[PDB]
Design a protein around this nucleic acid. Structure first.
Ligand SMILES: [Mg+2]
Ligand SMILES: [Mg+2]
Ligand SMILES: [Mg+2]
Ligand SMILES: [Mg+2]
Ligand SMILES: [Mg+2]
Ligand SMILES: [Mg+2]
Ligand SMILES: [Mg+2]
Ligand SMILES: [Mg+2]
Ligand SMILES: [Mg+2]
Ligand SMILES: [Mg+2]
Ligand SMILES: [Mg+2]
Ligand SMILES: [Mg+2]
Ligand SMILES: [Mg+2]
Ligand SMILES: [Mg+2]
Ligand SMILES: [Mg+2]
Ligand SMILES: [Mg+2]
Ligand SMILES: [Mg+2]
Ligand SMILES: [Mg+2]
Ligand SMILES: [Mg+2]
Ligand SMILES: [Mg+2]
Ligand SMILES: [Mg+2]
Ligand SMILES: [Mg+2]
Ligand SMILES: [Mg+2]
Ligand SMILES: [Mg+2]
Ligand SMILES: [Mg+2]
Ligand SMILES: [Mg+2]
Ligand SMILES: [Mg+2]
Ligand SMILES: [Mg+2]
Lengths: 117, 143, 98, 69, 128, 58
RNA sequence: CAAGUGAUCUACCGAAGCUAUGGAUUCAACUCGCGAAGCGAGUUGUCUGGUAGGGGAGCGUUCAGUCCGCGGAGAAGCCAUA
RNA sequence: CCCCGGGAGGGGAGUGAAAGAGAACCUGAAACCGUGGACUUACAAGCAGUCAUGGCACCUUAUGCGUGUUAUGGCGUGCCUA
């Protein structure tokens, strides 16, 4: 019995083409170039899934020592002094948000400045 | 879930430059313009400040630098361009000196160029932006 | 400002559901009681383990599965593609505590 | 009985090696390594110094009995 | 006017084309015909017939003729108001293609493509 | 073959990029003052043949 | 006016290394349904970069037998889809 | 039979379950060409994606949920063979 490709190739192909969506030019309408684009897209995906966590670490750090310098401290100094004070163990995420609620971050700064004199 | 501010704020500031080493006043201006000060919130947004450098003519250039510093620039022409100016030829246009330092210490991208818009340099002790009454700054932080 | 920080969270957002890594606490049965690293439950707040002398209870709401994801791995020139489905479970917890 | 419920003894039947057919297993080269390994195969008891080349001591006939311990 | 299944909605709703007319298989390339048609577009049908009288392309001809069947069909088959028509839509699409092989230097051949056109245009009572 | 030849096929985008300049200009048609039809300027009204008076047949 | 440099003291940043929380796979042991191993498992320890290459479990297409059925109030194929 | 056209072609009318079968006559994918609409682009350096966030738009596996688009930031050296 013969068993020609029939329905199968078109269906895998459409699966890739639908992954394409807003890909510029042939990247979204010709199969081979869509497939190949998605190879490099795999690369980018997995590695960024890692990276985003370095990213938000960086951003919270920026904001935290921005607030720390608002009061005459700095990230090195404020983070250490908080660490010295019965280990606060707030995440760097959480210290930022208290850089959206200044009256508290202030007291955290005075507390870090304490366990440090 | 991290906070992402909207930025109605415009923030004018008046940095004096007399006697400040150029790179140092530069770094302070570049930081204040890029954000940094205050919780930076989004890198995505140009939420930094407008700086109004004055007395840019009086910038100190500690060391031999006043006549060693050779700013260099290249015209498209393959006749030898690369013209060079002494920085003692800040007499030709002192704001360029300041404006060059700062743009070096700014990002080079689309948003960075857009940031250069926020620098206003005047070699004299005067400026026309009275309508924004800038806050004075000092020049250096303390431990 | 409530914070699911890490795995066990400690921040003042009175009265709402939020998602967490899981529990084993069947149904609403959990009623999980919580540490507290700092929350402003009345303007005032503290950290110095005085937050530990406070605690926030939370009703469990329901177990769930996160959105589907496809882990995708590739390396050039060596064949080697890898497609693999994944989604991580969670527990949704309502908050009520002091 | 259930002709649909006939079941071959597990084991016994095992699937063939389908060779070409994907980087899911045994890809480009078909288990063959990039070589002077190419279709029209040729040899089985041969290298070129041959060494099954030791000498012979030869009788032609034989005849023997059915054995009854 | 809801129906229950396809076949009855098909046997009692015949589905018409107001203002529409097509010139299938015109022997011109769609690119040029499109230049003319693009000048005609959202335009009063008088000016359509005018601009077409005075525009120097070889394709002004068939595009004019089709511009008329629209008008005709709008006013005969569809009962519209000619003093009110306009070109609500007009477009050119590709027909089949007469491929003719042609000789060339030093023995080779070559395929010339006489393109054809489907010129359709569609008129309407420009209200507002 | 053909000394100079093009390098990559040109994009669907850049090809229509060049073409932003081929749109035709419509005639500045005007209403003839006697025949009440339309005519090209500084030419003779085709419909009636008139040019202030009347020069051409029909 | 070190952002240069020799010695020295710390605090912080910093990776897919270590860690927390969750979960899956490989092998090993301990528990069970059985009547036979071993299947389905559950618990702990543990493992889990990979080219040629070896091994294991599988997905999909046509055709055939058997079962179960669907179809003009609509089959297959086609198209969109969170 | 009627309409525009020298015709070709078409629009009606009529037959038929159906003309969403009309003789370029089953389905009718894709490349490729067009029309309309949403969101968008004329200081800009680009393996064309990817992550992140804001803006705008729509709500039939679908109102925390997305889906489409987009601005800016970070990151990023096509595929295969050899
Ligand atoms: Mg890390
Ligand atoms: Mg590469
Ligand atoms: Mg290699
Ligand atoms: Mg195998
Ligand atoms: Mg080979
Ligand atoms: Mg051979
Ligand atoms: Mg009927
Ligand atoms: Mg010849
Ligand atoms: Mg690890
Ligand atoms: Mg673990
Ligand atoms: Mg285990
Ligand atoms: Mg490993
Ligand atoms: Mg492995
Ligand atoms: Mg049906
Ligand atoms: Mg069949
Ligand atoms: Mg007739
Ligand atoms: Mg006819
Ligand atoms: Mg039809
Ligand atoms: Mg049909
Ligand atoms: Mg055809
Ligand atoms: Mg025909
Ligand atoms: Mg015909
Ligand atoms: Mg049939
Ligand atoms: Mg057909
Ligand atoms: Mg338009
Ligand atoms: Mg368009
Ligand atoms: Mg612009
Ligand atoms: Mg981008």
């Amino acid at each position: 019995p013969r068993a020609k490709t029939g329905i199968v190739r078109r269906r895998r192909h459409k699966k890739v083409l639908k992954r394409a969506k807003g890909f510029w030019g042939s990247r979204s309408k010709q199969y081979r170039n869509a497939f190949q684009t998605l190879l490099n897209a795999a690369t980018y995906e997995y590695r960024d899934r890692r990276n985003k966590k370095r990213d938000f670490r960086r951003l919270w750090i920026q904001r935290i020592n921005a607030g720390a310098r608002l009061h005459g401290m700095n990230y090195s100094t404020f983070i250490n002094g908080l660490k010295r004070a019965n280990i606060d163990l707030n995440r760097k995420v959480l210290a930022d948000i208290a850089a959206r609620e200044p009256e508290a971050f202030k007291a955290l700064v005075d507390a870090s400045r304490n366990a440090r004199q | 879930k991290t906070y992402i501010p909207k930025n109605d704020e415009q923030n004018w500031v008046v940095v004096d430059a007399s006697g400040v080493p150029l790179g140092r006043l530069a770094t302070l201006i570049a930081s204040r313009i890029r954000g940094k000060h205050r919780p930076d919130f989004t890198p995505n947004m140009i939420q930094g400040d407008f700086v109004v450098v004055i007395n840019a003519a009086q910038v100190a250039l500690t060391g031999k630098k006043l006549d060693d510093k050779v700013y260099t620039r290249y015209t498209g022409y393959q006749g030898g361009l690369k013209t060079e100016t002494a920085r003692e030829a800040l007499s030709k246009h002192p704001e360029r000196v300041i404006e060059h330092a700062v743009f070096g210490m700014l990002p080079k991208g689309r948003q960075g160029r857009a940031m250069h818009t926020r620098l206003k340099v005047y070699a004299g002790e005067t400026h026309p932006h009275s309508a924004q009454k800038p806050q004075v700054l000092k020049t250096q932080p303390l431990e | 400002m409530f914070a699911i920080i890490q795995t066990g969270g400690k921040q003042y957002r009175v009265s709402e559901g939020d998602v967490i890594r899981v529990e084993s606490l069947q149904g609403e049965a959990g009623d999980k009681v919580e540490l507290k690293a700092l929350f402003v439950g009345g303007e005032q707040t503290v950290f110095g383990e005085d937050a530990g002398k406070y605690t926030v209870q939370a009703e469990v709401v329901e177990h769930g599965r996160g959105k589907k994801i496809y882990i995708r791995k590739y390396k050039s020139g060596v064949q080697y593609r890898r497609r693999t489905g994944h989604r991580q479970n969670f527990t949704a917890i309502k908050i009520l505590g002091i | 009985m259930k002709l649909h419920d006939l079941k071959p003894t597990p084991g016994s039947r095992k699937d063939r090696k389908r060779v070409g057919r994907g980087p899911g297993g045994t890809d480009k080269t078909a288990g063959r390594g990039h070589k002077g390994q190419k279709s029209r195969s040729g040899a089985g008891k041969g290298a070129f110094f041959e060494g099954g080349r030791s000498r012979l001591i030869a009788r032609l006939p034989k005849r023997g009995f059915n054995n009854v311990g | 006017a809801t129906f229950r299944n396809k076949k009855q909605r098909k046997q009692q709703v015949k589905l018409r084309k107001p203002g529409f007319a097509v010139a299938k298989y015109v022997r011109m390339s769609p690119r040029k015909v499109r230049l003319v048609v693009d000048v005609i577009r959202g335009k009063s049908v008088q000016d359509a017939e005018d601009l077409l009288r005075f525009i120097p392309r070889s394709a002004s001809e068939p595009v004019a003729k089709v511009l008329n069947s629209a008008k005709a069909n709008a006013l005969h088959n569809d009962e519209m108001l000619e003093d009110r028509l306009f070109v609500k839509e007009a477009y050119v699409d590709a027909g089949p293609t007469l491929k003719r092989l042609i000789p060339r230097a030093r023995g080779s051949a070559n395929i010339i493509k006489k393109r054809t056109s489907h010129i359709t245009i569609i008129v309407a009572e420009k209200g507002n | 073959a053909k000394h100079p030849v093009p390098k990559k096929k040109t994009s669907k985008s850049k090809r229509d990029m060049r073409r932003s300049h081929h749109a035709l200009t419509a005639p500045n048609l005007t209403e003839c003052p006697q025949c009440h039809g339309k005519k090209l300027s500084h030419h003779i009204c085709p419909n009636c043949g008139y040019y202030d008076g009347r020069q051409v047949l029909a």
